[PDB]
Design a protein around this ligand. Sequence first.
Ligand SMILES: NC(=O)c1ccc[n+]([C@@H]2O[C@H](COP(=O)([O-])OP(=O)(O)OC[C@H]3O[C@@H](n4cnc5c(N)ncnc54)[C@H](OP(=O)(O)O)[C@@H]3O)[C@@H](O)[C@H]2O)c1
Ligand code: SF4
Ligand code: SF4
Ligand code: SF4
Ligand SMILES: [Zn+2]
Lengths: 158, 49, 382, 72, 184, 135, 181, 328, 46
Amino acid sequence: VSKAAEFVISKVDDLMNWARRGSIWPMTFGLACCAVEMMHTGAARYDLDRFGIIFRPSPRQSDCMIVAGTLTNKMAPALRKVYDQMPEPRWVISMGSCANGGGYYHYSYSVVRGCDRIVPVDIYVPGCPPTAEALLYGLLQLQKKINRRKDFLHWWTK
Amino acid sequence: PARTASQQGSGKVGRWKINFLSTQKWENPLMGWTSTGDPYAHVGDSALT
Amino acid sequence: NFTSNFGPAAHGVLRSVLEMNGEVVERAEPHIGLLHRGTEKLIEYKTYLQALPYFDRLDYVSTMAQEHAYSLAVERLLNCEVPLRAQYIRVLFCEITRILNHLLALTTHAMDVGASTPSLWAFEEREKLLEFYERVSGARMHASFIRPGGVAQDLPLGLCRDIDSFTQQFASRIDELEEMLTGNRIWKQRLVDIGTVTAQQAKDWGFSGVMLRGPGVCWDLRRAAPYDVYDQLDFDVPVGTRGDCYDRYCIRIEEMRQSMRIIWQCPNKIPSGMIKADDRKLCPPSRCRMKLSMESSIHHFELYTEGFSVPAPSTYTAVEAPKGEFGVFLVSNGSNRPYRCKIRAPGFAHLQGLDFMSKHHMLADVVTIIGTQDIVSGEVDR
Amino acid sequence: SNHTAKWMQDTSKKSPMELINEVPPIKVEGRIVACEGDTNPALGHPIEFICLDLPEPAVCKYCGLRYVQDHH
Amino acid sequence: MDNQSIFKYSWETLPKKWVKKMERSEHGNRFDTKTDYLFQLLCFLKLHTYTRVQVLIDICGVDYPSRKRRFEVVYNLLSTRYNSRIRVQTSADEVTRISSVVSLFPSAGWWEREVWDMFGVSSINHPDLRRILTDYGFEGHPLRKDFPLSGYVEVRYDDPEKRVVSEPIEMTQEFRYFDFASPW
Amino acid sequence: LRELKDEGYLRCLPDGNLLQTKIHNIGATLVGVDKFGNKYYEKLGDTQYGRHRWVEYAEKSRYNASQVPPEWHGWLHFITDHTGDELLLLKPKRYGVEHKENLSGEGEQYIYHSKGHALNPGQRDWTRYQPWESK
Amino acid sequence: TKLEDEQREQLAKEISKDWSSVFERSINTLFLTEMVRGLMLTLKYFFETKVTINYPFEKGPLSPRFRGEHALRRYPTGEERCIACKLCEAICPAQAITIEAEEREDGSRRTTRYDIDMTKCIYCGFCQEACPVDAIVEGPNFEFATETHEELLYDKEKLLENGDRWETEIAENLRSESLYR
Amino acid sequence: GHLVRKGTGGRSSVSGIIATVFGATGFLGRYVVQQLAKMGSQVLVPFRGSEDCPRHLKLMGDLGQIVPMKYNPRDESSVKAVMAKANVVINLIGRDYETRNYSFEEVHYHMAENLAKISREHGGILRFIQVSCLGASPSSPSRMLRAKAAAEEVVLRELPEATILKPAVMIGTEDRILNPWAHFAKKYGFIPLFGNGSTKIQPVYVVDVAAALTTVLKDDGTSMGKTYELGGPEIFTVHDLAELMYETIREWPRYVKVPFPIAKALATPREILLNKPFPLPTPEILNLDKIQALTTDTIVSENALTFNDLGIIPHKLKGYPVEFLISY
Amino acid sequence: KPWEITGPCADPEYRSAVPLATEYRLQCPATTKEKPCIPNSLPETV
Ligand SMILES: NC(=O)c1ccc[n+]([C@@H]2O[C@H](COP(=O)([O-])OP(=O)(O)OC[C@H]3O[C@@H](n4cnc5c(N)ncnc54)[C@H](OP(=O)(O)O)[C@@H]3O)[C@@H](O)[C@H]2O)c1
Ligand code: SF4
Ligand code: SF4
Ligand code: SF4
Ligand SMILES: [Zn+2]
């Protein structure tokens, strides 16, 4: 395995993952009241920019998509078209309780039972609306996921 | 619907009601909930009185 | 005439389409179905005590005035009086909710126009008030705390002292914010004379709340039809002289200050007593009685299985929500499920407003108009 | 054996039934008791007056405690 | 105990040709009229210099699937000058082109579109433009007592086959309906 | 020197947060230490209302929330100013499960599943009847 | 628009009474005194302290009346509390509970399956109010942010039973709410 | 142990099948798992190494229907635990180019043999569907084809009740001929024609290949040990296929020539330098197997079986199955 | 301080927004030093 080269590969993966986790750039999708709470996360109390996180509006240069709210049969195509227009490394955080699993209006027409059907959600979150602490902990869970992302090793073995 | 065979009240008799004899349920393999596919699964005896 | 689109801060989800001409909005038209849920259908296939959270979800900024309106509707239809301490704490929290909504709408307007520091300071204050919520009952937002006939749980001890501390520091904070925005020539030149509305077309397009009170006509439901303790709580009710963005803004700040006056008048008169009922047939019994007496258990069981039954008639009930005349139309008949509960959020009136009052302006002024209207697509669509 | 097999999965620590059989009877003195624990609220289990006129223990139908009369 | 004055004056001076029912309750005063004169009655109000309403608060539909006149249109409207509100409630069947009020109160186009798609009641003059609340081409009118809570065709999901599609409903954990009724 | 500098001090240079917590520490006092090794401090005084009780996780590299046990979770979220040692004097006996942080990402077996999910070694079957099943 | 011409004249004829007034207003709008005042306020806030709760080390304030990850308590004897009343399932406004019971072998009644697909369970609170034995409760834990929907479909009472890992903390809350609830 | 349909089609209907799809991470894998889970069936997908490569097909099915499991190859215990509870096994593994630590022989042949032997071990399977290629016995160049034919034989031998599909070259929303040609044209001097310029092939619509796979999967007691090929709807020369691509992309065609010497002398260094200590680039359009299968015509044997025996031939490769080009 | 010349910052009736712990919340909501007995009925009724 050239144990030295495997160590260099491990360090390269560490650097790459550290950069990608410390410069993460979300993309809001503020359908319903969770948007409010998400703003409270981006507010002064549980600051988000402190973790190197900037709500970039244009979906051509963002990394995550935060589906915060409640999908709708009228809104699904727009969400899918926005998701497609992102670069390769992507992640999806499903805020709220109806962006994941239908939630309340789950038992109602004109509502998509959870955004999992449209985009491949990565980490959801619980809440109604999730306490700003819960959303920030969700993003830190996303950091913990992207942190076990040995990638250069995969290319060196592929 | 005839009077319930447990109580002795009368506030639920003489109330014409239509049922769609829809019975096509099955067991959701993940958990065990009762799935269905008929749009008229419950409306006939849930709102149409 | 160009045909531009507008699908945007996070000021809700809305699809504006604009017949344009140079930099003039010859005709703006919103597409609004973009967030629909079937709240009325659900309420029907639901109940009273189970459908209260729906009203909590509508107009998700002002998260308690809605429950207050629904509770007033059920009580009016039901003839169930409510004790004085319940009324007083209910008004207290309705006014805290008004302050919440005003902070959010005002400073999000400031962000749309370009400022950011007012947004962050207002959001700190919103954090304080949401902490009050989650201490009294439930989560930060969406506290299902105002049931038919009073409140759910009594409030803790020390909450009044904290209320007073917040009152003082918040007078100071409003003063800071007003010094930061009111008078800045940029803000003045960006806001004034943008979206004039004569009272004739105001009453025509059926505005309510600050909007209707912006241009001239002085009419709010708290003074006209004083549903609750509001009499003993004298206040001011400001009114604007020339209906436009700047005057609606000043109205909003004066409404904040009057809400502070009310929020202080309550903890000086709050009559320590019982809450929420005197009949364990419309309000469930507390835990000690439920687990010791016998008929208390029967009533708790029946009341949490089938709820209370309200009689045949149908009613309309209006409340001065932070936005406007939040209306509820109940057509209940006999059984415990509300037949055809219809909502009358002011979002419809305010969007048709946008349509007519957004002519012969520029796109920055369209954004300004949305800001001053303080729309919540949640309630405009439900 | 079957109920705990339907719901529980671990089968390493003892099931609720096993624990409530591990607790011994109470051996009360009179003829009628009332089971809540030690508080009236905050511990639930509404008043459940249960007779004690049989040579075998008597369960409580909430948190079966198996009270038993002491003397004859 | 609120607005007996306006209601009494309006009933005692109206052309009594077009009033079918009057209810002076304490929940709300009702002028149930005929669908043929509705525009005439509403234009009487908003103009008479005593009972001038000048603001229309709501136009809501109610569905009764057991009467020959299936629907029930209801206009809740107040008088900001005389501090009073009345509720003019008309009947309406399946297809029966009801008059419009967008000429009088321009704040009815959206409420009349909403009552066009939620219910199925028509509207002869302008306000009957296309649907508003429901998304797009929609089978039924999803607020009468027939359109089930979960909709006819509502599954809507992505397809890497092509892009995205709408397919008939096969939901899991069917809607349970509890009874709770009580024969006294 | 270098011992503790490598233990819980030098990680701050590329970790950031640990530097802020070290500053809050030089201002701090001590109020508790929990079996997971972590130290709960309280710098009560003229500081503020939101930031005067906090915790150093004693896992310097991979420190994650929910590592706090329930008692210290309460004392840390201000719900009740009862110290972890007191709530652990309470500590219901006759049963109980030691704490375990929300793994949710370290393989499905450290993660968990329902009784019908294929990755669960149980994999129940939901039929609500039986077959005839002749010999 | 003829009146606007007339109004703009009087509004100018009113403020321009003397020379001191016009001079003051002119150098007021010419030296940006309101700009300077805004800048000074901003700089004060800059020098002032911050809020920045610094989450992963000092979380925010809560209240014993909080709602979060559910739990099923049990008596001090280790005996389960739930008795399958179906009250929680009946009052569920989201129908997010499924519960199915059977007479046990020893005689008492208990739940064979009890699950709450946490998503569909909006966190409203009615659970902990319908229960006549305080079986289900909402412990003050909000950090459970799994990466697969199935988890948030909390399992057939098993994981719910594991809510007893908070049994001390939860207990505290309940005591402080026995008085006024 | 015959399964039972317990629904009405559509999502959240059981219909019994549980399928392990080895290779379900790329093109045909995506399409076939889409078909299976839309029909309603549990699917277990293994991924060699990633956290997000199968992520997309995580959404094409109800909860707990699609399950991504673990590191797939080079371990018998891993493959066994992945096939722990399958009803059918669908094999699609196989690259188009060798990488130093792998080789056509190794991957195709030995992995097919491993899968056959572990299925023998877990002899509770019902249908082993192996998809290989439009490639014959070692009677053609491109050693991938020789090894793949040996793999076909050994999987038929270790599983006499198996089904081996031999589809022609596939064109779809993400293929490896049309997209490379469009990329090359849009980038610089236009496309080359290898071999002669008029070599014959039968391109096929991938959705229709997947429908054929679902059909042969169900196929109630009609063909349980069959090995046959899946051609296209019409015979296409490579020149005419390039002209089709050009008419659909709305650009001007230009072709490069003198194919065999440049092809050989410019594709041979890749393998040499490859087996010589770190990964090397991917063969964009100079793939040796491309050179071989284009220097020899392979269209249809007209001898064993076809779509016509299974189900109607693809729609046509003009209207919809090429409509994905409009992105240019 | 250099601003302190005009605005709310130069007014004796001005308060800041950093309430210290002891002065804002010196009694946590759970274990108060009292024992509240909320009323729930009137004697006549009971
Ligand atoms: N050229 C064609 O389009 C064509 C024409 C006829 C027949 N076929 C046949 O159709 C089948 C599917 O083709 P395809 O286009 O979809 O290719 P493919 O997606 O790349 O299929 C191979 C899969 O296995 C993975 N893989 C790669 N190297 C591996 C290794 N050493 N061990 C295990 N897995 C490995 C691949 O990448 P990951 O590791 O990222 O998963 C991919 O997931 C193949 O058997 C091919 O021979 C193809
Ligand atoms: S509880 Fe859910 S559906 Fe409701 S406003 Fe929140 S994110 Fe939306
Ligand atoms: S109300 Fe309490 S014990 Fe009764 S069925 Fe529900 S959680 Fe279970
Ligand atoms: S918390 Fe509410 S939404 Fe969740 S199940 Fe309990 S009663 Fe229903
Ligand atoms: Zn007991």
